[PDB]
């Protein structure tokens, strides 16, 4: 009886690779960035990078190059996927769309063959005559890249050498090398073999082999100018080619571990080179020009440009722009300068991408206190480390709030001449209209000499000569500014109700039903100029200068009435252009016509909560983009915002949403508010960059944030944290953090940069004499600290440090026994650099008041406290292989009963409200209940057959979530059998599924607000944020099959079966997934198009397109 579903609530945002080259256009330069699923593809330019598109694949990528074989127009992408599939791809727009083509594609998987330490490494070699895989230890993959071989057909060559570091086809050679970096006892060498295809061997070197450094780890093939191989150690770098042999051991660099390089000049002349620590070098070869010899090379050099933040990838993008692909820290773009600047750095940050990095721990609180939720995680790692707080869409800060029922409309005002801005605001009622005035943040209200108070006002807008249009359903009128009347006034000829209004500036266009009339306002007078009618009665209208031209508009988008039909035509005349019919008897609310970007916008909403968007050529207005999506269930009331520059639109409805520009699609996320039922934007004195938005009964101003489905706040810490509790009663988070020093000169260890447990705003010291027991005069300690963050600055108010070598391991927000008060709880460990696992910890008790942070209660304990829950009263720990529960006297003294235990070493541990337990020993999941008996637990079952778990959760009393440290994730159940003594003791495993990333927490919460059931976020190394939510049978069948009918269809890029890729696997076994269901591929249904749409759909059980529309839709609005 399991059935689950899991989506993705943020795509991962960590980089892994990240190439550059041709991929687009011969003549056009690219970055390829590689998440984990996704293909990230940007095109160079003079700004920054202007993306074009982004694919998901079915797989982790693992290898990603760009190459161009001969007769071979640009350059194709390779990529080799974690699980082994290989593809060539190719970028192909030619129409308005663009296609990541698949050349050819094979899985190249190896029955045998052990995966090799330093993992798979992916090359190609430089005329393109092969792929180079070096999957396996003791094995060499060959690709022959012929034009055929579209299946990748390789074979494999043994490799005598069983340990291999690194290895790249050389240079300059007539034939395949490669060069590689090996070990065996004796240190670590360099050898070399040519390639032979012809006959599947390795040949003999151009060369010799010699030894490295023992921590020879990367080796680099440098360019036919040159040809010959870098290889990177510790405090070390070397040429190699032939008899020649250089060699540098720059101290600068003895310090971290070089880990990335990339080539700056094609002549191989420098070269980026990437530290752990985060410092960027350049690595320079200088040439020398010989008489008429060749070009030969003279020496290394290295020398510091300055800091990046810790670099997985890297790529000199151009003109001295290099990107920063990093995976502990946010990605950017930074210049390279010739000069230096201040703090001495030849290196500047041009632009910083979010990276939720490592997701090491996290918990979701309502911050705000508002009914919503929100995503606090500890992320990143070093000086790379943070807070994020992740939250649910666009946000508005209030200011003046007036309890005013009834509001049909809201429209600018500007109550002085040319002085810009705004100062009184009008609001039409049900059959009124009653003006405002504004000397600030005051909202009194008296009426102009010039308007009307007891006529529903259709329009409230400025235009020219020194007037206010004010169109009421009874007449077009005009207002002077300066003397303060009427100029003129227009009158339906006959007296007959205006039913539609429509007025830019320049212009005007009522509608009485089915007619049109054309008024403008010329020099303080009203200009009739035209009348048609039509076919059916006019819904609704639209002029504004959708681009060209100043005011005097252009076309006129029409909604009509029973046809439910849409349209533009031409305003001077009114002939009909082109129209669109669509569906139903619900007639259209609203019509707009916007610009963003390099796409002209029309768009139509209808009254039932459905809303449609529509591509205009400014020029004539060709039937362009359409697709049903829907918002409420309202009508939406369209309406023109300022936002920045790219400036946008507002959909009011039962369901506030914005659409903003992303690539160059416009956003579709939710403004968090009870319901907006109409809208104007704003400049106005007291009130500077504000919005109007009415409702039921209520008036409101204000900003409004960035866009995104998710809303990001980064806080800096400098230092990783580990993890962290929400702590109500004290309005504060408390997170435990570590920070690295090093032994100094008095050996006392120092400190490398400030952060946050020494910048602290207050501090204090463990002080405890628990030990009582050696060190190098030069190296590395870690220091942990507590941290308490308040919840509204995040400030750190203090940081406590612990003993030397302690290290907190686990943390807990609770109260214990009869106690009121409630402590923050620290359990550590001893750890001590020799002997490995822990002999000593302790746990302590802290509280946080007044505002001060006092250590209650401390505790030793006889091993490392890997983790800790609140259980009922008492306080549950995990102590190196035994769990203990300890009970607080109510003399404030935590203590425990010896002859009571349970021996378990539980890495991870939840419980449910009852006197349940999810613990973890030797690869196993295990449920116990707390017996009052035996005063200890009793092991009521557990899952057999391996797994190295990560994270646990319990889903509910029945059912226990997995994930484990090869991208699965499973469930387990107890079994409802027979004989409830041992069937009832094995939970069976009733769920699997590949997830593809590696999950560090669970934890249950939502980030949405206010029909599946239950949820669970999770967070992973990658950054990516997913959730997991239980279905009922039926559901589970109709997504299950839902998923199956899909596969078929969609075009999975690299030619990988959706079935393989999330089929569970672990080196030991491979299963087809069970009791899952991804969102992920169930929400691609949407962007599917119809013809495609109703071939799924087809036989259960109504079984509509637009049917099935909406119960996608309601599962988009899990996260």
């Known amino acids: 009886m399991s059935y689950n579903y899991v989506v993705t609530a943020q795509k991962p945002t960590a980089v892994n690779g990240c190439v550059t080259g041709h991929f687009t256009s011969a003549e056009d330069l690219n970055l390829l960035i590689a998440k984990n699923t996704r293909l990230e593809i940007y095109v160079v330019t003079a700004e920054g990078l202007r993306p074009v598109k982004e694919v998901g694949m079915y797989g982790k990528i693992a290898v990603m190059e760009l190459f161009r074989p001969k007769g071979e127009s640009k350059d194709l992408l390779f990529i080799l996927t974690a699980k082994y599939n290989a593809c060539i791809l190719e970028y192909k727009q030619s129409g308005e769309s663009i296609d990541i083509i698949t050349r050819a594609h094979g899985n190249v998987q190896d029955r045998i063959g052990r995966p090799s330490e330093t993992g798979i490494i992916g090359i190609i070699d430089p005329e393109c005559r092969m792929i180079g895989l070096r999957l396996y230890d003791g094995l060499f993959k060959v690709i022959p890249l012929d034009r055929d071989n579209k299946e990748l057909k390789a074979f494999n060559i043994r490799l005598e050498e069983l340990h291999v570091i690194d290895v790249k086809f050389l240079y300059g050679c007539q034939a395949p090398t490669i060069c590689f970096v090996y070990q065996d006892p004796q240190g670590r060498h360099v050898k070399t073999y040519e390639v032979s295809l012809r006959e599947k061997e390795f040949n003999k070197g151009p060369w010799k082999q010699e030894n490295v450094e023992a921590e020879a780890s990367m080796v680099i093939a440098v360019p036919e100018p040159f040809g010959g191989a870098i290889i990177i150690g510790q405090e070390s770098i070397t040429y190699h080619n032939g008899d020649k042999y250089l060699a540098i051991a720059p101290p600068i660099i003895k310090q971290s571990t070089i880990v990335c390089h990339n080539r700056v000049d094609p002549n191989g002349s420098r070269y980026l080179l990437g530290d752990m620590e985060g410092r960027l070098f350049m690595l320079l070869l200088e040439k020398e020009e010989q008489m008429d010899g060749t070009v030969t090379l003279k020496d290394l050099r290295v020398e510091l440009l300055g800091e990046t933040s810790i670099a997985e990838c890297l790529t000199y993008l151009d003109n001295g722009v290099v990107f920063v692909g990093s995976r502990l820290g946010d990605s950017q773009l930074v210049k390279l300068n010739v000069d230096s600047n201040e703090q001495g750095s030849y290196v500047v940050a041009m632009e910083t991408f979010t990276n939720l990095g490592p997701i090491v721990d996290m918990c979701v609180v309502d911050l705000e206190r508002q009914g919503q939720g929100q995503l606090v995680t500890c992320s990143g790692a070093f000086k790379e480390g943070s807070l994020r707080i992740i939250r649910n869409g666009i946000g508005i800060h209030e200011h003046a709030s007036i309890d005013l ?45 010039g308007f009307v108070d007891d006529q529903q006002t259709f329009f409230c807008g400025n235009v020219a000569h020194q007037q206010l249009i004010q169109i009421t359903s009874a007449s077009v009128r005009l207002v002077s500014q300066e003397p303060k009347a009427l100029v003129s006034e227009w009158k339906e000829p006959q007296a007959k109700n205006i039913s539609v209004a429509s007025c830019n500036s320049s212009q005007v266009v009522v509608a009485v039903g089915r007619a049109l009339y054309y008024l403008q306002i010329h020099p303080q007078e009203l200009r009739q100029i035209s009348h048609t009618e039509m076919e059916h009665e006019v819904a609704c209208l639209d002029i504004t200068p959708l681009g060209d031209s100043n005011g005097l508009s252009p076309l006129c988008a029409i909604g009509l009435w029973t046809d439910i039909s849409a349209r533009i035509l031409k305003l001077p005349s009114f002939e009909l252009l082109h129209k669109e019919m669509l569906g139903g008897e619900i007639i259209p609310r609203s019509i707009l016509m916007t610009t963003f970007e390099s796409s002209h916008y029309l768009l139509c909403a209808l009254g039932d909560g ?15 983009d359409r697709k049903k999506v829907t918002l409420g269930t309202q009508p939406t009331v369209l309406r023109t915002f300022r936002s920045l520059s790219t400036t946008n639109v507002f959909a009011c409805s039962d369901r506030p949403t914005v659409i903003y520009s992303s690539n160059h699609k416009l956003v579709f996320s939710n403004v968090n508010l009870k319901e907006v039922n109409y809208m104007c934007p704003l400049n106005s004195d007291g009130y500077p960059d504000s919005l109007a938005l009415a409702n039921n009964s209520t008036l409101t101003i204000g900003t409004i944030d960035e866009i995104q489905k998710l809303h990001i706040r980064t806080v800096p810490l400098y230092e990783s944290p580990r993890k962290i ?45 628990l030990f009582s027991s050696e060190t190098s005069f030069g190296e590395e300690v870690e220091v942990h600290n507590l941290l308490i963050i ?16 302690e290290y907190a391991l686990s943390l807990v927000s609770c109260k214990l026994g009869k106690d009121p008060n409630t402590y923050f709880i620290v359990g550590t460990a001893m750890v001590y650099p020799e002997e490995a696992e822990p002999k000593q910890g302790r746990i302590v008790v802290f509280q946080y008041s007044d505002g001060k942070l006092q250590t209650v209660a401390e505790k030793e304990v006889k091993g490392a406290v890997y983790s800790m829950v609140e259980f009922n009263g008492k306080l549950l720990a995990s102590i190196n292989s035994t769990v203990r529960l300890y009970e607080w006297t109510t003399e404030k003294d935590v203590r425990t009963e010896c002859n009571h235990y349970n021996n378990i070493m539980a890495l991870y541990l939840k419980t449910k409200g009852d006197f349940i337990l999810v613990g973890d020993l030797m690869r196993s999941v295990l449920l116990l209940a707390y017996k009052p008996m035996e005063g200890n637990f009793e092991e009521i079952a557990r899952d057999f057959n391996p797994n190295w778990m990560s994270a646990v959760e319990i889903l509910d009393d029945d059912n226990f979530l997995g ?21 009832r003791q094995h939970l069976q495993e009733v769920g699997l599924f590949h997830l593809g990333e590696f999950v560090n927490v669970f934890c249950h919460g939502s980030l949405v607000m206010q029909p599946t059931q239950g949820s669970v976020l999770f967070g992973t190394v990658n950054g990516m944020i997913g959730l997991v939510t239980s279905l009922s049978e039926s559901w589970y069948n109709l997504l299950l099959d839902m998923q199956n009918r899909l596969n078929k269809v969609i075009k999975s890029v690299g030619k990988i079966e959706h079935s393989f890729w999330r089929s569970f696997h672990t080196e030991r076994k491979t299963e087809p997934a069970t009791g899952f269901i991804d969102g992920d591929l169930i929400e691609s249904f949407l962007d599917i198009s119809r013809p495609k749409m109703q071939e799924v759909v087809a036989n259960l059980r109504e079984a509509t397109a637009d049917d ?3 119960v996608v839709e309601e599962l988009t609005r899990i996260h």
């Open 610 to 624: 459905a809303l449609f968007y529509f591509g205009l050529n400014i020029e004539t207005g060709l039937l362009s």
């Open 405 to 449: 029922p009834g509001i049909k409309g809201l429209w600018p005002l500007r109550s002085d001449p040319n002085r810009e801005t705004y100062d009184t605001l009008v609001l039409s009622f049900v059959g009124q209209t009653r003006v405002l005035m504004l000397n600030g943040e005051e909202v009194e209200e008296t009426e102009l000499m």
């Open 1108 to 1110: 099935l529309i909406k």
């Open 963 to 983: 994930a484990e440290n090869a991208f699965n994730l499973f469930v387990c159940q107890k079994d409802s059998a027979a004989t409830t003594d041992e069937e």
């Open 790 to 805: 308040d919840q509204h600055t995040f400030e750190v108010l203090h940081a406590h440090q612990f003993l030397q070598n």
């Open 725 to 769: 509790c929400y702590q109500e009663v004290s309005q504060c988070f408390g997170v435990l953090s570590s920070r690295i020093e090093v032994q100094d000169t008095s050996g006392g260890t120092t400190a490398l940069r400030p952060s946050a447990s020494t910048q602290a705003l207050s501090s204090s010291v463990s002080s405890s004499k």
